[PDB]
């Protein structure tokens, strides 16, 4: 049969753009005049979550995606 | 008796190399 014929469609369209960054610094809660973390925030008492991961605030969607679950208090 | 030229001739008795093989077989 004939080939895919998917090369000449979708005109005047561009790919979804994801920002290129070097470090993951501002992704976390860093408003302490030094970028450090305090002990007032609670840690989840469950085993399915990594110890290193900490809660963060993003003015959109959420700091997540593999499980596609919003972790915000809402 | 040499068999290589005999086989080469028996594969095609009237091919491009028939004259040379037949001549080599004579002697």
């Amino acid at each position: 049969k004939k080939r895919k014929k998917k090369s000449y469609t979708t005109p005047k369209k561009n790919k979804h753009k994801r920002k290129k960054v070097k470090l993951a610094v501002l992704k976390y809660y860093k408003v302490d005049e030094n970028g450090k973390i305090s002990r007032l925030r609670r840690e989840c008492p469950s085993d399915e979550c990594g110890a290193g991961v900490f809660m963060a605030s993003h003015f959109d969607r959420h700091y997540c995606g593999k499980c596609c679950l919003t972790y915000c208090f809402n | 008796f040499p068999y290589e030229v005999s086989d080469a001739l028996q594969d095609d008795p009237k091919g491009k190399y028939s004259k040379k093989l037949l001549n080599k077989l004579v002697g």
Partner: protein, 105 residues
């Protein structure tokens, strides 16, 4: 073929098919002795093997077919009756004494 004849088989045919000389393929076979091609007594009386040999030009196929003698394990000799093919077993005929008088002890 000479080995098979010296092995004791009463027939063998081998075929080498493919490219032996030139771009085109020749099927070249040698057969000697006897070889049945039909009927049931080609399973228990003929052994056939097909194999492939690679070459800078391609693949050569080797087909070897062998006849087997009458009695098992390569014709050891007559044994308990398990007939499988036609044979004329001719024993030594009886011989009479030439002398007019019979045996004396």
């Amino acid at each position: 073929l000479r080995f098979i004849m010296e092995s004791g088989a009463k027939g063998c045919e081998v075929v080498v098919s493919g490219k032996l000389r030139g771009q085109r393929a020749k099927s070249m076979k040698f057969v000697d002795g006897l070889m049945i091609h039909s009927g049931d007594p080609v399973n228990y009386y003929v052994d056939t093997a097909v194999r492939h040999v690679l070459l800078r030009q391609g693949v050569l196929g080797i087909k070897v077919k062998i006849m087997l003698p009458w009695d098992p394990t390569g014709k050891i000799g007559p044994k308990k009756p398990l007939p499988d093919h036609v044979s004329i077993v001719e024993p030594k005929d009886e011989i009479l004494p030439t002398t007019p008088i019979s045996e004396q002890k």
